[PDB]
Structure formats: C-alpha cells, structure tokens
Amino acid sequence: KVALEAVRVTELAALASWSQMGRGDKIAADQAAVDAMRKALNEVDIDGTVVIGEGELDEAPMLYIGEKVGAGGCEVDIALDPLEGTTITSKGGANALTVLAMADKGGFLNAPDVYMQKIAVGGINAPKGIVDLDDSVTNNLKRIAEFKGVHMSALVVCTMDRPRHEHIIKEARECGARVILINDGDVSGVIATATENSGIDVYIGTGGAPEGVLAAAALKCLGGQMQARLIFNDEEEIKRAHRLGITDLNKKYDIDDLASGDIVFAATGVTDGNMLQGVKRVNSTRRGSYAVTHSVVMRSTTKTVRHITAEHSFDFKEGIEKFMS
Amino acid sequence: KVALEAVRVTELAALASWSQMGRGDKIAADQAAVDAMRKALNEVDIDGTVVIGEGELDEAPMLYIGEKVGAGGCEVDIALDPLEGTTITSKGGANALTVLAMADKGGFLNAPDVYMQKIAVGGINAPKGIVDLDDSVTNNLKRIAEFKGVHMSALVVCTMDRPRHEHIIKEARECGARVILINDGDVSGVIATATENSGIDVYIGTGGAPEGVLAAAALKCLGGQMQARLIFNDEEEIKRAHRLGITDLNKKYDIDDLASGDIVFAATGVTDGNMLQGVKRVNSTRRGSYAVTHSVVMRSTTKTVRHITAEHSFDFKEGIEKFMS
Amino acid sequence: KVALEAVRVTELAALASWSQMGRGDKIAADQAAVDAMRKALNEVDIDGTVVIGEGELDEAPMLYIGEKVGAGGCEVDIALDPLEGTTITSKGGANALTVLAMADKGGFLNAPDVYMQKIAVGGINAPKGIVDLDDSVTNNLKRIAEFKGVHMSALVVCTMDRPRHEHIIKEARECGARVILINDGDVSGVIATATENSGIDVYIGTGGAPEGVLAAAALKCLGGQMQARLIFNDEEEIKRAHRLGITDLNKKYDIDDLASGDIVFAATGVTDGNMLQGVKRVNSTRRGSYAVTHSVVMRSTTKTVRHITAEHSFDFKEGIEKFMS
Amino acid sequence: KVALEAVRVTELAALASWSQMGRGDKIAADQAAVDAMRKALNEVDIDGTVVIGEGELDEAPMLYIGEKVGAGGCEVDIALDPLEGTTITSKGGANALTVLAMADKGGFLNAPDVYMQKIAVGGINAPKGIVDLDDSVTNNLKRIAEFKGVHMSALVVCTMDRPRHEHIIKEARECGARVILINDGDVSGVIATATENSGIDVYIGTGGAPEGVLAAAALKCLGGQMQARLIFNDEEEIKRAHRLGITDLNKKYDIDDLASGDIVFAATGVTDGNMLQGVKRVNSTRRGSYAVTHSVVMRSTTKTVRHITAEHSFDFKEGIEKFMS
Ligand SMILES: [Mg+2]
Ligand SMILES: [Mg+2]
Ligand SMILES: [Mg+2]
Ligand SMILES: [Mg+2]
C-alpha cells in the first residue's frame, strides 16, 4: 500500500538530525527531527494516528499521543521516534536512528514512557519459548547456543552500559558468554540480533517501553523471538500505566503481544551503529557532492526486506542547516 | 510521489524473468516478464497511458500502445521494457534487466520499432554539446578524454557485438582506446556510462529506439549527454515515423529531445550486467531462503538515486516458476 | 612460505593485461601478461618450475613447461595460465582472470595438453560420490539438488557456449533446470560453483586440462566436489599419455588426484566475470587516481581464503601502458 | 615479497584478541594479542628490531623495545600495537585494532608511552602546513573547510570523550563545526581522517605517543598532514626522554618527523570502528563456518593500499579460545 513511502519520512528525519549531529544540543536535535518527520509524515496517503511518539499532548506540541496524521488513505496506527538517541546524535555516538512503524488499528502495545525488561534473539528457524524473562540468564543462553549450533563462548550478548545490567553481565560471562556494551540505543541493539552482519547473537537488558515496542515491530518482519516486561519503581508510573488500559502490571509480553497484524517498519541511520550505517557526505567526479542515507523497509505479511542507500544532492558550501525541514 | 512504488513492478518483472533464465525460451521469458510487469501495474494506484509497451498492435493482444495500466490517479506517460535481452535471458548472458520509466505527456519521444544510432557519455558536470553523430569518432573521443581529464588509452568504449559496428571499433581502436563488446542490450550499456564503478566511459552503437529513449531517461536523472538518430531500411520503417508526428526523419535528437520534464526511472537486474547485479538464491540461517533483487530508482527533478536490494522470502523446494504470475 | 606474495604476481599480470583490454591484439595482450607475470615471479623467493601451461619454448607462451623461475627460496611446482583469457582480454569479454597455482614438486597432475570432461559442484560437505561423469546429466542434477535441498528447477547450470555441449544443455534443460552459457574461460566457470555470490550451482563441460588443474586447485581450498576425465581420441594423444606412465586412460580424477598436498591458488579479475570483478579506473578527491584490482588468494593446508581489493596509484593523463613494465 | 605477509601477523593477533572480546579481562586480552603477534612475527622473513612495542626491557617481557624479531632477512625497525584498546576489547567497545608498521633504520620516532597532542587531516591533493598545534581550533578548522571546498558547518571533527578535551569541543562547536566523541582508540580516530567512507574530516586530541607514531605511519601511506607534540609531565618521563636522544621536549613534530621513508603499514579490526570493521562469525551454507577478519595493508613508496577480507575456517562448536596461539 504505503510501505516503500515511509522510508522518505525516516530519511528526512535523519538528514535533519544529521544537521545537529555533534552539536551537543539534544533539544535542537530532537526538534529538527520531530519537525522534519512530522512535515514528511503529513504527505503519505494514510489516515494515520500517532499511537507512540514524543509524549502526551500537554508536553509535546508535535507527534503527541493521539495526533491525527497522514493525507488520506487506509486507516492505521503510527509508532515513531523522530530520533532514537538524541543524546547519541548530540555527541556523535553510535546507534542513532530515525524510526517509524505502522499497523492496522490497535496493533501496537499502548505503552507508557516507563522502563521495560527485554530479551531478544534473531532467527526464522523455530525459536519460541526459547527465550523467557522468568528463566535464568544461563538457561536462556544455553537454549540459544543449542538453537544456533555454537559453543557458548561464541555467543555475543549485547546490553547497555549501566549499573542495572551488572548482574546479567556477570552471569552471562561466568556462564561462558561474551558480553559487549553499547552506551545507548537498544532499538538498534535488539534489531541487531536479526540483522545479517551485526556481530550480536542476543540482546538482554532494560530500557524504554516505546523503544521495545518499535524493536518488536522490526523483529516481527525480520524473524525472531522477544519477551518484554514493563517495570515500575514509582506509583506515578503505575497510575501512568493504569491510564493507558494496562492493568496486568507484571505481564510478560511476547512479540505478537507487542506488535500484531500487518506491520510495516522503516528506519534510517543517523550515525554508524549496530544495525545501519550513518549519513555520509560524498563528493564524486560525476554527479558532484551528495549526502548518503542508509535505510531499511520491512513488512510482516510478505516479509520482504529492502535495504536502500539514497544519494541526496547538496552543495555543502552553505550550512548543513538546509537539511532541516 | 508516484516514484518508489515503481520499484516493485520491475522487481516482480525481474523475478518472473529470472524464473525463465537459462531455459532457451525467448517467448516464455519476455512474455512471462510482460505478464508480471502488467499485473504489478494493475494493482498499483496510477493511471498509465502506455507510450512504450511491447507489440505494435498485432503481435500480442494485451501489451499494446495506448494501453491504460494501473488504477487511476496521475495520467503520466509510462515507458517499459519488461525484459530487454530476452534471448540472453533464456541462457544466462549478461545485461538482461526489467525497466519502468515515466514522465509528463511527451516528456519522452514516442518511439517506433526501428533502429537507432546512439552516442552517450555520463556524469553531470560541464559537458555541453560534446558528442555529435556526424562528427568523427576520433574527434568525439578526443573531446571527452579532454573533458574527463584522462589520456585516451584509458577511455573504455562499449558497443554491441554486431558487424554493423566493425568500423567504430576499428576506428576507436586505431585511435588507441580500449573498446569492450556486449552481445546483449544497450540500455544497461548506455546507462553504465554514468554508473559509479561500471568501468565504461562511452557508448557508441545502433540498437532499438525504445531502449535508446529508456536509457536517455536514466541519463537525464544521472545527468549525462546523449545524441541519437533513427534510421530505416525498408520504407515501412519510414511508414510508422510520419505516422507518429515526424517528417524531419533524419532529425538528430539530443538528450532533452528524448526525455525532458520530471522523470522517474526504475530498473531491476535479471542477470549480472554492467549496471545492476542479477537475482540470486541465498540461504540465510537467520532468515531462511530468499531471492535478492538489485534495483535502482531515480528522478530527474531531485536527481536523487536509490539503490535497493530486496530480500524476497521463498522456499526453493518449490518450482522456480512460482515466481511467474 | 610464500602464500600472499603470489597474489602480487596475478595483480601485475592483470594490470599489464588490462593495458591491452579490447585492443584486438591477442599477441600483445598475452605478451604483456607473460612479461609482467614472469618478472613478478622472478622476484618471488622460490625455486619454482613451470610444470603446467600451454606450449614448450618458442611455440606459444613465453613462460613455458620446464623453465626454472624465482630468486632463490623453496623448490615449488607452478601451474599457470598467464591469462587464461587472452582470447577474451583482447576481445573485451567477461571472465578474464590472471591465474597462478603452487604446489610441492609433484603436487599437480602432469596432464598431457589434452581435453577433459569436467563436472564441478560447490559445498563444504559435498560427498565425493555426489558427482560422477559415468552417470546421466539428470541423475547428477537430481543428486546435487537433493544435497542442496532445492527443487531441480532452482539449479543454475553453467557451461561453455560450444557446439560439443548442446547435448548436456538439452538434457539439463529437460530436467526443468536452468542452463546459462559463457563463451569465455572455464576456470572462472568451475570456481564460480564454490563462490559466495555467483548465481551458478553446477559446472558441466569439456575443456582444456591445465584449466581443469587450476580449477581443482581452487576448489580444494574452497571446498566442494569435482570429477575430471582426459579425452583420448587419437593414438598420438594416448602415446603422449604413455610417455608419462598414465596406465588407466578412462580414470576419473577427483580434486585430490588433480592437485595434492599443500596448494596455493591466486587469481585476479581482468574483466567482470562469474568469480572476480574487473580492474577499474578510480578518481577520488582525497586519494586521487588509481586502478583497483579484485583478487583472491587461498591455501589448502589452512583452508584460508583472502579477498584483496587493491588500489594502484596512477596518473591517467599519461599513457596507459606503464603497468606493463 | 615481505609487505603483504604482515597482514598474517595482525589477523593472528586480532583473532586472539577476539577470543577475549566482551570477557571483562583486559590483561587476558592484551596478553593473548602480545603472544599471538610475537609468535606470528618470528615467522616473518625480516631482521626486525622493535622500536615501539609493549614497554621497555624491565616492564614488558614480550615485544619489549630493542627486541630482535623475525626469522631473518632485510633490516627493519618495527612499530607494534598488539592490541589498541585493551579496555575497548574487554568491553566490546568500538575501534579495537591490531597494528604493525615497518620502516628502515631511524624511519620512526622512537616514542615512549607519554601523552602526545595531535592534530590530523587527510588528503593526497597537496595539503601541508594546514594544521598547527600553536594555531587556534578556529584557524585550523577554517583552513581545513576552505581546503575541502566545504562550509565550516560540514566538517566532522573527532576527539576522545575526555574532560581534557573540553576547550577543543567547545571552541570547535562555536565555529559552527560538528564534533563527535569516541570513547577510545585514537589510532582509528586519526587514520579515519584519510579513509574513504569515514565520516571524519579532522582529529584533534591528546593520547598515546606510540599510537600517534603509528597513525602517522598510516597517513604517510594514505596521504595527509598531521602535527604532534610530546608531554613529558613527570621528571622520570623527562629523564627517560633525554635517555633516547630528545632534548626539545616542547618540539612540534611534523608527519615526516614521526614516520619517513619506506613504510609498510598493516592493521586488522577487532571491534567495528572508524577505520576497520571487526571480526565476525559467519555460517554460510556453501562455504561452511568461518571468522571474517577485515584488514588493510599499505606502502608509502608505491602508495598501494590493499583491503583484505580473510575467511578463517572454524568449527564454532569448539571454544573460541582455539583462536589463541
Ligand atoms: Mg527520541
Ligand atoms: Mg523487450
Ligand atoms: Mg596496545
Ligand atoms: Mg599508548
């Protein structure tokens, strides 16, 4: 229907964000991104409504939860991060993306801005029940080593550099695994388990709830397993979840529970990461100077995956500011 | 915003064509790529007056000229070749590819089924007026070794392996320039004059006029210079020209004359060629079996060029012609 | 122990050979390739001896059977085709490689410049009974289709566009399997069966015997099965076979028979082909002008396979024939 | 015929380093690389003396400054980093590299592991005198943006995330430039200024002085400018500076002073980075299971750069510690 057109949205949000890469301005980065994604997303033939975005109305003037978007077409619910990794992008760190998923009405978990435990593994073969948040780290990786046909010492486990991950990092290591640390970007790091050239076999750790819904949306189209659990340390978070319909607070959600039906997923890299290469300036002797975006588009029914590298003309003698929409 | 949806038309055309590759069938090959091209079009939302279909009128009752393909919207002009080099498809020779192009009402030259003399070079910089058909082969190659800034022994020049070209070859060679030869198709041969790492600087040859204007469209998105002229043997080859809006019959068409306006150009490789790579069978252990297609989509206004590798899920224990509807 | 230095000889050969690409002088093409290759060899610290190659002395090639070569080092037997495609290099055709192979003295089959039946398949775990020249085309294709877990129509079969192959072209096609033709060398074509992104599954064909030994030496490092048999039509060929104690004349030869012990294989693309990419001219605004070469070098002991993209600075405003020296 | 064999050394160190990746043990990782590199290097046909290694006579048992290495051959001064980023590898961070360079006697600055101020830009199109440590961040960035024919806002400047890099980050960002921060690895950060799809124009920062000599070696092969200065900042460092022919401890060193003459540079990636990708496990259905290394070899005389993708066969059902010596 609309699948291949969403990638223009992510591409322009990543050009805008790339304008603010290395500037150290989390707010200019996130605003150039929201600006440009909203501007491009009001031009796709959809009757879309932002199920997940930059927050509730009062806080976010643009791409707030509930906002009507799209120019006219099939009725869909929209999940987005105009820029996943505003801090990353502001520093020039790895694993920053612009991300956008779409489903038939009510297909995404209606997730509050709250932490979420995660375990993910890639593979179309026959994984499921392979991965379970209520089981040991050792048992999950023992199963995964069996499924992949490797020694435990070959598995590469990704998680975020935090204190809250210390125990998983220790258990996975004495269990025999290799555990690598990303500063930030667990969307990139979850999807990297099902991304053909990452060096990452498993992702374990806790991070945003929306990041986890968007990553599950990708693993639906790539093929994988993933469990998630929302978590709380604050009655304000519990009321926040109560106000979204969520009553079963310790529910383990599987990939189907997080994204269901005809999902389409699209991302663009802003900086080099686990999953996508970053945006680059190129000057050829042929067509002159241009900017290069690396994008992916994926669909859950057909399961076609498309890797797209786009060349965008730019003089580069006036500021990168003109990449901002 | 008509553009990127064009890519799945050429993707499905090259899949159907790849099904018949290496089987010795010319009719099954091209006529299987035409079916898919059109059944892809007849589920796309566009209104498509066909400028360049297949059969003139008599040859086959559903790929005519004046055909209206798609499903309404913009009424743009749709040039096709659902497979060029369809002998070279049915037994694996290089440079088979499925192409779809479209512009505004005669953005193009509506072309007849006669032969065409062509000279082409690539890369949008400052070459203006550079190649002439009248003017000498040595003079053309001298001017463009000047422009590209290289000694003339470096220039690679490309031609169809026909005896009708023996002069150009010899003369280009007696000029001291390496000259390669294809058996195949001159769309990818001319287009490869502005493709990045093709290893080809110039095309000089006589081939079909449809293929000439399709590569002209490519070249106006990639930014090259081309001159062509239409030639005739029997006077029925004169018939269908004045019966189309032409009486300067030995008119000399420069690049704007074959294609101008807001142009979209989409191609997908069927076999490994000088421009795209062909379809392949891959067995991912993460993803299981699929077929990759290597594709390009571009546009004359923006001059944006997208390279698209697509993973199409397929279980290769089923007949290859499951790709064929 | 000279593993990777051999790749420099094939690089120098392919650059000199590229000088004469499509210059229609077969003689100056292979003269340039033999001059470059033999000087590069003489600066490789080996006590090499040229045990495979067409001709003797002043009969066809300049490097010839029984010539001592090198600058000291280990004593080694050298298999060659200083350019297995001087017919295609000066023609402008595909599958032009420069090739070299090294074994312990007595490592290669001493073949008596006679033709050869060849059937080759790729695959790390191919059983050796998997392919048999005494069996039907179709039995072979059905057995390897089983091994690969494919429908026989998925299998792409590659052979040379020669009249003597029409029969196996036909039977292979009545399998509903697909058959693709090359006018060019069969070293490229046999190794493409164990090459990552060649679209070629099986090679069946008759061709020269040096080319068979070089193909066997590559498949021995790459993996996969190959069976070969020398063709003895005349009392003269048989006596040449008895002048070297070849008792059985119908012996079927496996890879271990064709090349045995410690094998080094190295090849460099001259033009685009089934296995390697051709040499190209590049201009980058931060490096400059260089020609790129695409090589493979490999060894049977380690079973290590190295892929070498090399950049050779060259000012291209001056004459193309400076790599030749 | 010694140039390329250096890649075998770095590969061998990188596979051993890779055993220890994400294992949390930095001594085990540096020790695995030191042991693998020393063993591999004693196989190489050179009369090498270590001029830059792991430490001095007393501190470092293996690869100590002054050590005679190699099997015997041409007299060379060796500069080594068995493992750059021992911390990086232990945690699976970016820009872990194994590195080896060779030159004639006196070709290297014999640098102790003191800190070094560094500024680096790449380009073979005649940059020189463009970077000065004594100039402002603003003056240098202005000259560089002019030299690249680019707006000041386009330059990506790179430095390590350190408090001692506050001024350069602040000052650089107020000129309008983008500044990106790497956790560690200033060899990969400086060499990225002269690497093709590096998104990095300048490196400004302070780090290891040996890491600076080695980045200088690469840049003499790749083309670029760089200026550096040692910081002997405790009296033992200053006296151990006078102990090696130094007296002007505030001397600025040009690139020629850090690496001059006949220079061979080789490196292999351990983790993904700004210069090289990291080692991966690959499980291919044709080729079997292997570990990919990505390496670069280059020479300053010939300005030849070789990008080397190596496939090292491995049963990944055995411990990854098999990749150790
Ligand atoms: Mg965000
Ligand atoms: Mg056609
Ligand atoms: Mg070190
Ligand atoms: Mg240091």
Author numbering:
A (entry chain B), B (entry chain C), C (entry chain D), D (entry chain A): 4 to 328
Paper text:
Genetic screens resulted in the identification of the gluconeogenic enzyme class II fructose-1,6-bisphosphatase (FtFBPaseII), the product of the glpX gene, as one of the most important contributors to the virulence of F. tularensis strains SchuS4 and LVS. Thus, targeted inactivation of FtFBPaseII should prevent the bacterium from producing fructose 6-phosphate (F6P) during intracellular growth, regardless of the specific gluconeogenic host-derived carbon source that is available to the pathogen. Similarity in the structure of all classes of FBPases is displayed by the presence of two adjacent α/β domains, one of which is usually two-layered (α–β ; CATH code 3.30.540), with the other being three-layered (α–β–α ; CATH code 3.40.190). Previous biochemical and enzymatic characterization of FtFBPaseII has shown that the enzyme is only active in the presence of Mn2+, as opposed to other divalent (Zn2+, Cu2+ and Ni2+) or monovalent (K+ and Na+) cations.
